[PDB]
């Protein structure tokens, strides 16, 4: 691992523990998802985006400038993690395109971090040749470079380094007559250099992913990696952490105000439907009950709450006991986990059990058409510009980012300060805002 | 060709998922799509639209609609129960009753068990909504459980019949078979013998001798003429009615074998103590856990027992620390017995030795290679791995349509070893509590270098077993080859 | 005191119990380390020079191992017997048709004469199973997991009726060379633990064994495990005050230091009952660090099962009580007409493996990939060492001389160990000339 940036074209051949394998895979998936969401919400160049991604990389300890720690741990972690994700994502074309996009964003960011003085060696360490021109040569050919330069305004040839590259590597660049050539070697600025670098890296990644897709059948035989790699991105949550077992003081009467103040749209509308109809289907009942368990509702409180709501349903309380108290206690209690023991997550709500007629469960953004989204948002009293940007984000299939923006709107803040992946995290952050 | 077929099939699956639908099964020859629609015409037009869009994406692919199910219970490939929707004229349809793979192989079931299974299947294949079906099934199961528990049920329904392939004395496992036991009893005590090809009738009974159920099998008239012993209701609820119903109800979402046991009687405790935890796991979960926590990871792992040398009192080591809040004390600091003043930390050697034995035993238990059939009705428990094989795993010699799988999975043993190393992983356990001043005070008050060395030795006693532990480490060279 | 009081008060001290070969003088002795002594592990890809790889099993791979074993034995038997061609098990054939497959017990219990099924190979019968009826068969000897060719008649396709069994053919012996015949007579000691009584830790039997080793000065001494039995009540109750590894190291160092003066070569064969070592079959060689140059030259640690050659004589070493396990689940037409041990040894030699029984006994763990690649017979051994709980014996079956010395200590009573001279005879003459000359199983 000579350099921090690196091109991933040499698979590792070490041995690692299974726990390390899983940790690396999960960490890199979290990093990529964070990169995607951060690029979607912000602009790719603003200092805010760079600082936030710096913080994410520091917390995930994936890369850093050269030092004792960087030599050993972050660089190997990055290498093996990238190749594990290669195994995970080569299954489908959509996954390949998504992986390529986010890896390109990460590489561009890391390149921007990299100080200029080292770029040369990186280009040398990349195993393909790019040569930097001398100051005397730059002074001599400044007029030629400016004349051949793109629509870049003025004759100012600033401190940006200029490099000598074969015309073959700048096909798409010099084909438009927007660069200077000399003896078959082209002189290019930094921005176009990084463009070329990312283009070649994309070609290499596409070829490698195709090869791994072909090679998958040999490696899919393993049974202790199938359940992890099959659904590494599709259906794995990035450390939701809002599991069963939380503590708090929730008053049953207050629930209503909480519902209109600190609930995510899914749970907000589920609660409204419950209150208005005094009944829920199986899926919505399970989802909302699990959410209430997550926020801090104790078993007796939950039983009393559901029983009190069902008395208004005009059905025998003893029937309620014998029928549903068993289910509620089982949900709050013993084995059968991962479907009843654990509160749902935004990813599970979106990707599992789409609602049907007469069913009010599911994420509203994903499961309700834009007209009804606008109706609901109006009923929630959100500014028209907020609604427009929410709809724009939904059209971009960034449902969780849309919910984040909705959080910011209702809480009357600018930045929520996190990345929601679990409704209970929504409620916890809202309560933290009080 | 196979690679391209798989690629296009996966693309079609993801596309139809994007269409706000959900696909429940398909292998290169069929695709079951759940429409979430109760209107037949809507379903037909939706099928036409998906066919048209896939056709315009792939010009030469000629897809078509083969059949429609009003309601379907899916369990496996060619294992389901459905109401085939045969479309009649004027848009009306007939719900033909169809079901494949529900056949039962063994005929050793009580008449009451057969009646309960018939009721459950009929209810599930009724057209009423899911909630109504579940409510009816739960009500019937509770009623049956109460009726059996209180003895209201006729005894004649508890009778069991089983054929005899060989002479009663020639069965190698005669101890575990109730019917051959009754055959031997009738041959010895009675007159006319029982030969191969005859059917023997028996009913399980409670003798109070704390024996296995197979040993207590008694003839029906023998039970009727004897009063010292009665019918074993618990056995019938546990492995004569629970199997039949749970074979069908378990797949339904929101209902679990534990829940069925709770409905049926007072089994839940002893049931989950005596329950199979194999089919419950299913990676189908769409975005649930990432890596769990130690509490739910080592829940199934057996706790580390140890006898205190001084007093002999049992000690359980299920975590590095014991107590609540301020008194977060190491489990080895004091003996579990309040009267004993001997700190287990003195007897580390014995501890380590015992640990070895424990892990040793587990390894042997893993290598016994006990295979169990997955169909709850059969649950054949063999050890001779059959050469005959199926798509998923070994084929059950009894159920020519089923799949054996290990009783003690390899990953269960790996989790057990990891739990053993975690019990003594003092350093890592010192990084799980947030309050730093608590860590400082606690470690300065108990975690001296000597006890740290002892804990490290205990870790190593299992880490040396884990190092050679069967792909507990993954080799990248093979993976990326 | 009372512990091991019997050993201090046993009258049979040093009295030979059985003899085989030619009459030999009671003063058994060798030349010690002097002279050219060859001691080389042999065959079967080196039989676990290293420690191991895994304790992780895959059902498809175990299936591949099993079917490969069946098919290899089948090809060998077919080429030897000039069998026309095998037929699928499930094919209903009116005329008698040869069928290939491994025997198995129908249920989970002890095999019965009419509770037997035949499981075929994939390339012929797709691994199908079929019950077999032995009523018509006259003479047979079967056990679970043995590969057989049965020429019964199966007119229905659902149940075969046996009509003749093909005695399996053993591997060819080890072809010697001029150097092998160039070896003078050498005496071999063989003993099998446990080396302490059921209620002692003093290891008095080990001290007596060391004394006899020093006095006799044998050429090579084979010591089987366990060295601290896992079934020992002392360790089963974890009353020991020292780690298992420390106690094993102490015992090994005592053995090594005791026989320094003898100059006898020493080899240690692990056993599944060894508490400290890995509890999996096959077992890699023991691990020891404190070895000098002379000690390293005089002591060898070998795997188990191992097939080592001493002075060009193939030794078949196996510490697991294979005889007992096979006898537990072996059926035959006649019991008293022939000796049980003879036919069990016949099966061991014929099946070409150091543990042909399948599925093994409950108190045994077999890793089938390593077993397949490390626990196959390379050649019919000249001498077979199988210390078993059964009574000591020395048989000569199919040329190979199989010796069961017996456990060195039974409960609290004394045990026995086997001495045996070994001299490769004239290069030519009689077609079969067993290098073994005389064998004496003698009480300790
Ligand atoms: S993004 Fe998550 S919290 Fe927000 S509405 Fe959807 S499921 Fe609920
Ligand atoms: Zn005590
Ligand atoms: Zn079965």
Q: What does residue C416 show for φ and ψ, rounded to 5 degrees?
A: -140, 155
Is A228 near ligand 1, meaning CB less than 6 Å away?
no
- Give the Cα separation of C67 and B351 in Å (integer): 43
> Near ion ligand 3, which residues have CB within 5 Å?
B 373, 378, 380, 396, 398-399, 402
Residues with Cβ < 8 Å from A246, sequence gap 6 or more?
A294, A295, A296, A424
- Give the Cα separation of A148 and A150 in Å (integer): 7
Is A400 near ligand 1, meaning CB less than 6 Å away?
yes
- For C365-379, b/e burial (b = at least 16 CB within 10 A) is bbbbbbbbbbbbbbb
Positive or negative CA dihedral for C270, C271, C272, C273?
negative
Resolution reached, in Å? 3.1
Is A426 near ligand 1, meaning CB less than 6 Å away?
yes
Distance from CA of A332 to the nearest CA of B (A): 13
Atom of ligand 1 nearest to the CA of A363: 6
Strand partners, C383: C315, C401
Atom of ligand 1 nearest to the CA of A366: 6
Q: Residue with the nearest Cα to atom 2 of ligand 1?
A: A346
Q: Which of B143, B174, B160 is nearest to B108 (CA)?
A: B160
Residues with Cβ < 8 Å from B398, sequence gap 6 or more?
B105, B106, B373, B378, B380
Phi-psi category of residue A384: left, alpha or beta, with phi > 0 → left and psi -120 to 50 → alpha: alpha
Assigned token pair, B398? 């009894």
Contact between A187 and A133 under an 8 Å Cβ cutoff? The reply is: yes
Q: Is B14 exposed, middle or buried (0-12, 13-18, 19+ CB in 10 A)?
A: middle
Contact between A393 and A401 under an 8 Å Cβ cutoff? The reply is: yes
| Pairing, β C220-224 against β C265-269 | parallel
3-state secondary structure chain B: CHHHHHHHHHHHHHHHHHCCCEEEEECCCCEEEECCCCCHHHHHHHHHHHHHHHHHHCCCCCCCCCCCEEEEEEEECCEEEEEEEEECHHHCEEEEEEEECCCCCCCCCCHHHHHHHHHHHHHHCCCCCHHHHHHHHHHHHHHHHHHHHCCCCCHHHHCEEEECCCCHHHCCCCCCCHHHHHHHHHHHHCCCCCCCCCEEEEECEECCCCCCHHHHCECHHHHHHCCCCEECHHHHHHHHHHHHHHHHHCCCCCCCHHHHHHHHCCCHHHHHHCCCCCCCCCCCCCCCCCCCCHHHHCCCCCCEEEECCCCCCEEEECCCEECCHHHCEECCCCCCCCCCCCCHHHHHHHHHHHHHHHHHHHHHHHHCCCEEECCCCCCCEECCCCCCECCCCECCCCCCCCCEEECCCHHHHHHHHHHHHHHCCHHHHCCCCCCHHHHHHHHHHCCCHHHHHHHHHHHHHHHHHHHCCCCCEEEHHHHCC
Q: Which of B331, B330, B329, B338 is nearest to B311 (CA)?
A: B338
Q: Which helix (H) or strand (E) holds C205?
A: helix C204-216
- For C161-178, b/e burial (b = at least 16 CB within 10 A) is bbeebbebebbebbebee
- Give the Cα separation of B472 and B417 in Å (integer): 10
Phi-psi category of residue C31: left, alpha or beta, with phi > 0 → left and psi -120 to 50 → alpha: alpha
Query: Pick from A18, A225, A351: which is nearest to B286 by CB?
Result: A351
Q: What's the N-to-C CA distance of chain C in angstroms?
A: 20
C233 contacts in chain B (CB < 8 Å): none
Assigned token pair, C410? 């039974």
**HSE-CB of C277 using CA atoms within 13 angstroms:** 28
Atom of ligand 1 nearest to the CA of A403: 4
Q: Which of C105, C154, C367 is nearest to B397 (CA)?
A: C105
Assigned token pair, C180? 């092998």
Distance from CA of A336 to the nearest CA of B (A): 7
With H, G, I as helix, E, B as strand and everything else as coil, classify residue C13: coil
Positive or negative CA dihedral for A36, A41, A46, A48?
negative
With H, G, I as helix, E, B as strand and everything else as coil, classify residue C54: coil
Residues with Cβ < 8 Å from B323, sequence gap 6 or more?
B329
Assigned token pair, C19? 């003899």
Distance from CA of C394 to the nearest CA of B (A): 32
- Give the Cα separation of B377 and B242 in Å (integer): 9
Q: What does residue B200 show for φ and ψ, rounded to 5 degrees?
A: -105, 135
Atom of ligand 1 nearest to the CA of A400: 1
Q: Which residue segment(s) compose the domain that A169 sits in?
A: 7-230
Long-range contacts of B456-463 (CB under 8 A, 24+ apart): B456/B426, B457/B348, B457/B352, B458/B348, B458/B351, B458/B352, B458/B355, B458/B423, B458/B424, B459/B421, B459/B424, B459/B425, B459/B426, B461/B352, B461/B355, B461/B356, B462/B355, B462/B359, B462/B417, B462/B420, B462/B421, B462/B424, B463/B421
- Give the Cα separation of C80 and C73 in Å (integer): 11
Strand partners, C314: C309
Confirm or reject contact between C240 and chain B (CB < 8 A).
yes
In whole angstroms, how far apart are CA C46 and each of C305, C374, C376, C385? Answer: 11, 8, 11, 19
- Give the Cα separation of B378 and B401 in Å (integer): 11
Contact between C438 and C20 under an 8 Å Cβ cutoff? The reply is: yes
- Give the Cα separation of C361 and B367 in Å (integer): 11
Assigned token pair, A94? 């959509």
Contact between A109 and A139 under an 8 Å Cβ cutoff? The reply is: no
Q: Which of C98, C164, C167 is nearest to C136 (CA)?
A: C164
Q: At what angle do helices A423-433 and A265-277 cross, to 10 degrees?
A: 100
B367 contacts in chain C (CB < 8 Å): 55, 57, 280, 364-367
Q: At what angle do helices B242-249 and B257-264 cross, to 10 degrees?
A: 140
Q: What does residue C266 show for φ and ψ, rounded to 5 degrees?
A: -135, 135
Say if the Cβ atoms of C55 and B363 lie within 8 Å.
yes
Residues with Cβ < 8 Å from A374, sequence gap 6 or more?
A387, A391
Is A265 near ligand 1, meaning CB less than 6 Å away?
yes
- What does the radius of gyration of chain A's CA atoms come to, in whole angstroms? 27
Q: What CATH number has the domain bearing residue A76?
A: 1.20.930.80
With H, G, I as helix, E, B as strand and everything else as coil, classify residue C374: helix
Please provide the size of chain B in residues.
481
Long-range contacts of A186-190 (CB under 8 A, 24+ apart): A187/A133, A187/A141, A187/A144, A187/A145, A187/A148, A187/A162, A187/A163, A188/A162, A188/A163, A189/A149, A189/A152, A189/A160, A189/A162, A190/A116, A190/A160, A190/A161
**HSE-CB of B389 using CA atoms within 13 angstroms:** 16
In whole angstroms, how far apart are CA C308 and each of A265, B385, C129, C225, C382? Answer: 76, 32, 38, 17, 11
- What is the CB neighbour count within 10 angstroms for residue A169? 20
B287 contacts in chain A (CB < 8 Å): 235-237, 345, 347-348, 351-352
Distance from CA of B246 to the nearest CA of C (A): 26
Confirm or reject contact between A277 and chain B (CB < 8 A).
no
Q: At what angle do helices A18-41 and A399-410 cross, to 10 degrees?
A: 60
Is A95 near ligand 1, meaning CB less than 6 Å away?
no
Q: Is B444 exposed, middle or buried (0-12, 13-18, 19+ CB in 10 A)?
A: exposed
Q: Is B310 exposed, middle or buried (0-12, 13-18, 19+ CB in 10 A)?
A: middle
Asked, as a colleague might, if the bond just before C194 is cis with ω within 30 of 0, I would say: yes
- Give the Cα separation of A119 and A115 in Å (integer): 7
Which of C50, C59, C60, C329 best tests the B interface by mutation, with the highest count of B CBs <10 A? Answer: C59
Contact between A163 and A131 under an 8 Å Cβ cutoff? The reply is: yes
- Give the Cα separation of A158 and B146 in Å (integer): 89
- Give the Cα separation of A194 and A222 in Å (integer): 39
Assigned token pair, C406? 């017996």
Q: Is C258 exposed, middle or buried (0-12, 13-18, 19+ CB in 10 A)?
A: middle
Q: What is the DSSP letter of C391?
A: P
Q: What's the N-to-C CA distance of chain A in angstroms?
A: 48
- What is the CB neighbour count within 10 angstroms for residue C9? 8
Q: Which of C256, C373, C401 is nearest to C303 (CA)?
A: C373
Confirm or reject contact between C35 and chain B (CB < 8 A).
no
Contact between A170 and A162 under an 8 Å Cβ cutoff? The reply is: no
What's the CA-to-centroid distance between A240 and ligand 1, angstroms?
A: 13
C143 contacts in chain B (CB < 8 Å): none
Say if the Cβ atoms of B293 and A243 lie within 8 Å.
yes
Q: Which residue of A has its CA nearest to B257?
A: A336
Q: Which helix (H) or strand (E) holds C299?
A: strand C299-301
Q: Is B118 exposed, middle or buried (0-12, 13-18, 19+ CB in 10 A)?
A: exposed
Count residue pairs from B and C with Cβ separation < 8 A. Answer: 128
- What is the CB neighbour count within 10 angstroms for residue B99? 17
Cα C292 vs. chain centroid, distance in angstroms? 31
In whole angstroms, how far apart are CA A170 and each of A6, A107, A111, A401, B77? Answer: 21, 20, 19, 38, 55
- What is the CB neighbour count within 10 angstroms for residue B265? 22
Asked, as a colleague might, if the bond just before C282 is cis with ω within 30 of 0, I would say: yes
Strand partners, C224: C192, C269
Contact between A264 and A289 under an 8 Å Cβ cutoff? The reply is: no
Strand order in the sheet with A180-182: A131-132, A163-166, A185-188, A180-182
- Give the Cα separation of C442 and C418 in Å (integer): 6
What's the CA-to-centroid distance between B315 and ligand 2, angstroms?
A: 8
What does the angle CA C55 – CA C60 – CA C61 come to, to the nearest 5 degrees? Answer: 50
- Give the Cα separation of C368 and C62 in Å (integer): 6
Cα C47 vs. chain centroid, distance in angstroms? 14
- Give the Cα separation of B308 and C399 in Å (integer): 56
Contact between B35 and B85 under an 8 Å Cβ cutoff? The reply is: no
Q: Which residue of A has its CA nearest to B3?
A: A214
Four-CA torsion B73, B78, B83, B84, nearest 10 degrees: 150
Q: Which helix (H) or strand (E) holds C130?
A: strand C129-133
Please provide the size of chain C in residues.
444
Is A346 near ligand 1, meaning CB less than 6 Å away?
yes
């Amino acid at each position: 691992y000579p350099h921090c940036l690196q091109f991933y074209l040499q698979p590792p051949s070490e041995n690692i523990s299974l726990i390390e394998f899983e940790n690396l895979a999960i960490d890199r998936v979290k990093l990529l998802k964070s990169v995607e969401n951060l690029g979607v919400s912000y602009v790719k160049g603003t200092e805010q985006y760079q600082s936030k991604l710096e913080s994410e990389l520091r917390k995930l300890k994936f890369s850093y400038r050269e030092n004792l720690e960087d030599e050993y741990e972050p660089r190997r972690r990055d290498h093996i993690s990238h190749f594990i994700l290669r195994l995970a994502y080569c299954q489908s074309e959509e996954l390949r395109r998504w992986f390529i996009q986010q890896e390109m964003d990460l590489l561009r960011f890391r390149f921007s971090i990299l100080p200029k003085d080292k770029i040369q060696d990186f280009l040398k360490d990349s195993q393909l040749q790019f040569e930097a021109i001398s100051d005397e040569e730059k002074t001599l050919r400044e007029q030629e470079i400016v004349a051949s330069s793109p629509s870049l305004s003025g004759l100012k040839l600033g401190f940006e380094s200029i490099y000598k590259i074969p015309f073959a590597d700048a096909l798409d660049l010099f084909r438009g007559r927007k660069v200077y050539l000399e003896d078959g070697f082209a002189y290019v600025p930094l921005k176009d250099i990084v463009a070329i670098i990312l283009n070649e890296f994309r070609a290499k990644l596409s070829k490698a992913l195709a090869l791994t897709a072909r090679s998958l059948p040999a490696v899919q035989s393993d049974e202790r990696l199938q359940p992890l790699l099959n659904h590494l991105s599709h259906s794995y949550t990035g450390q939701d952490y809002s599991t069963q077992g939380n503590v708090g003081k929730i008053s049953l009467d207050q629930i209503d105000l909480l519902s209109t103040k600190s609930f995510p749209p899914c749970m907000r509308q589920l609660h409204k439907a419950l209150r208005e109809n005094h009944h829920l289907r199986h899926g919505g009942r399970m989802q909302y009950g699990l959410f209430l368990k997550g926020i801090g509702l104790t078993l007796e409180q939950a039983l009393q709450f559901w029983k009190q709501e069902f008395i208004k349903g005009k059905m025998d309380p003893d029937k309620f006991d014998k029928g549903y108290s068993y289910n509620i206690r089982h949900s709050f209690g013993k084995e059968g986990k991962r479907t009843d023991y654990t509160p749902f997550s935004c990813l599970k709500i979106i990707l599992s059990n789409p609602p049907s007629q007469g069913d009010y469960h599911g994420c509203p953004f994903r499961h309700s058409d834009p007209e009804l989204l606008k109706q609901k948002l109006q009923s929630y009293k959100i500014s028209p510009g907020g609604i427009s940007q929410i709809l724009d984000l939904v059209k971009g299939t960034h449902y969780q980012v849309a919910c984040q923006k909705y959080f910011e709107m209702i809480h009357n803040v600018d930045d929520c300060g996190f990345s929601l992946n679990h409704p209970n995290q929504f409620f916890c952050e809202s309560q933290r805002i009080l | 060709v196979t690679y391209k077929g798989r690629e296009i099939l996966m693309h079609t699956k993801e596309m139809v998922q994007k269409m706000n639908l959900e696909v429940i099964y398909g292998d290169t020859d069929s695709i079951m799509i759940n429409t979430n629609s109760t209107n037949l015409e809507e379903v037909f037009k939706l099928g036409n639209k998906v066919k048209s869009e896939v056709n315009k994406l792939y010009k030469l692919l000629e897809i078509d609609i083969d059949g429609v199910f009003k309601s379907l219970l899916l369990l496996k490939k060619k294992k389901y129960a459905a109401l085939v929707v045969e479309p009649t004229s004027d848009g009306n349809y007939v719900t033909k009753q169809e079901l494949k793979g529900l056949d039962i192989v063994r005929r050793d079931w009580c008449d009451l068990a057969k009646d309960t299974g018939n009721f459950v299947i009929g209810q599930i294949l009724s057209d009423q909504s899911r909630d109504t079906i579940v409510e009816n099934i739960q009500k019937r199961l509770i009623e049956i459980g109460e009726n059996v528990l209180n003895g209201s049920v006729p005894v004649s329904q508890f009778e069991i019949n089983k054929a005899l392939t060989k002479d009663p004395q020639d069965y190698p496992d005669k101890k575990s078979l109730p019917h051959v036991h009754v055959a031997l009893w009738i041959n010895s005590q009675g007159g006319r013998k029982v030969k191969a090809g005859d059917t023997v009738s028996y009913v399980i009974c409670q003798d109070g001798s704390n024996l296995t159920a197979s040993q207590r099998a008694y003839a029906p008239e023998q039970l009727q003429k004897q009063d010292n012993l009665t019918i074993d209701t618990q056995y019938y609820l546990a492995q004569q009615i629970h199997p039949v119903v749970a074979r069908i109800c378990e797949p339904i979402d929101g209902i679990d074998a534990v829940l069925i046991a709770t409905w049926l009687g007072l089994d839940p405790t002893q049931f989950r103590v005596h329950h199979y935890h194999k089919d419950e796991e299913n990676d189908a979960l769409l975005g649930g856990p990432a890596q769990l926590t130690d509490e739910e990871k080592y829940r199934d792992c057996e706790r580390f027992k140890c006898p205190c040398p001084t007093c002999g009192t049992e000690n359980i080591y299920d975590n590095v620390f014991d107590g609540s809040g301020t008194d977060m004390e190491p489990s080895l600091y004091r003996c579990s017995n309040i009267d004993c003043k001997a700190s287990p930390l003195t007897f580390t050697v014995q501890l380590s030795n015992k640990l070895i034995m424990d892990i040793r035993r587990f390894i042997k238990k893993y290598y016994d290679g006990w295979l169990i059939c997955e169909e709850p009705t059969c649950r054949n428990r063999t050890r001779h791995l059959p050469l005959q094989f199926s798509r998923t795993g070994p084929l059950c010699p009894a159920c020519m349509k089923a799949t054996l799988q290990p009783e003690y999975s390899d990953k269960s043993l790996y989790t057990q070893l990891c739990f053993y190393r975690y019990i003594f992983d003092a350093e890592c356990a010192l990084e799980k509590l947030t309050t730093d001043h608590e860590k400082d005070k606690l470690k300065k008050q108990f975690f001296t270098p000597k006890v740290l060395q002892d804990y490290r030795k205990l870790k190593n006693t299992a880490e040396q077993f884990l190092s050679r532990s069967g792909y507990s480490e993954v080799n990248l060279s093979k993976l990326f080859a | 005191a009372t512990p091991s009081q019997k050993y201090n008060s046993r009258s049979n001290r040093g009295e030979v119990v059985t003899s085989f070969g030619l009459a030999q003088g009671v003063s058994w002795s060798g030349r010690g380390g002097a002279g050219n002594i060859s001691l080389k592990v042999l065959g079967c890809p080196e039989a676990l020079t290293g420690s191991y790889k895994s304790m992780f099993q895959k059902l498809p791979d175990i299936r591949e191992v099993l079917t490969c074993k069946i098919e290899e034995l089948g090809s060998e038997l077919k080429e030897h017997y000039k069998i026309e061609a095998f037929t699928p098990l499930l094919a209903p054939a009116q005329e008698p048709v040869t069928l290939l497959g491994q025997i198995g017990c129908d249920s989970n219990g002890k095999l019965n004469n009419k509770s037997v099924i035949l499981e075929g190979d994939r390339e012929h019968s797709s691994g199908a199973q079929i019950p077999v009826d032995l009523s018509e068969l006259k003479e047979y000897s079967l056990f679970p997991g043995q590969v057989v060719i049965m020429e019964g008649i199966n007119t229905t396709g659902r149940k075969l009726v046996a009509t003749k069994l093909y005695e399996g053919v053993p591997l060819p012996f080890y072809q010697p060379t001029e150097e092998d015949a160039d070896f003078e007579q050498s005496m071999v000691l063989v003993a099998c633990g446990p080396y302490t009584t059921s209620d002692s830790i003093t290891y008095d039997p080990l001290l007596d064994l060391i004394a006899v080793i020093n006095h006799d000065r044998p050429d090579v001494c084979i010591l089987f495990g366990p060295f601290l039995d896992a079934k020992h009540e002392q360790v089963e109750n974890c009353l020991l005050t020292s780690p298992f590894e420390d106690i094993f190291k102490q015992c090994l160092r005592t053995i090594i230091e005791g026989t320094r003066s003898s100059g006898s070569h020493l080899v240690f064969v692990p056993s599944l009952r060894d508490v400290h070592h890995e509890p999996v079959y096959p077992q890699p060689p023991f691990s020891y660090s404190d070895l000098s140059r002379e000690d390293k030259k005089q002591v060898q640690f070998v795997s188990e099962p191992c097939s080592l050659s001493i002075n060009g004589v193939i030794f078949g070493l196996t510490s697991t009580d294979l005889l007992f396990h096979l006898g537990a689940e072996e059926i035959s037409s006649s019991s008293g007409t022939s000796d049980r041990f003879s036919r069990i040894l016949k099966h061991i030699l014929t099946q070409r493996s150091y543990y042909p029984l399948y599925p093994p006994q409950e108190d045994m763990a077999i890793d089938y990939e390593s077993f397949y690649v490390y626990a196959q017979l390379p050649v019919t051994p000249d001498v077979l060492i199988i210390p078993s709980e059964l009574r000591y014996f020395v048989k000569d079956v199919l040329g190979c001389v199989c010796v069961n010395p017996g456990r060195l200590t039974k409960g609290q009573v004394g045990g026995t160990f086997a001495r045996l001279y070994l001299r490769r005879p004239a290069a030519d003459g009689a077609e079969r000339q067993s290098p073994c000359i005389a064998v004496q199983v003698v009480r300790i």
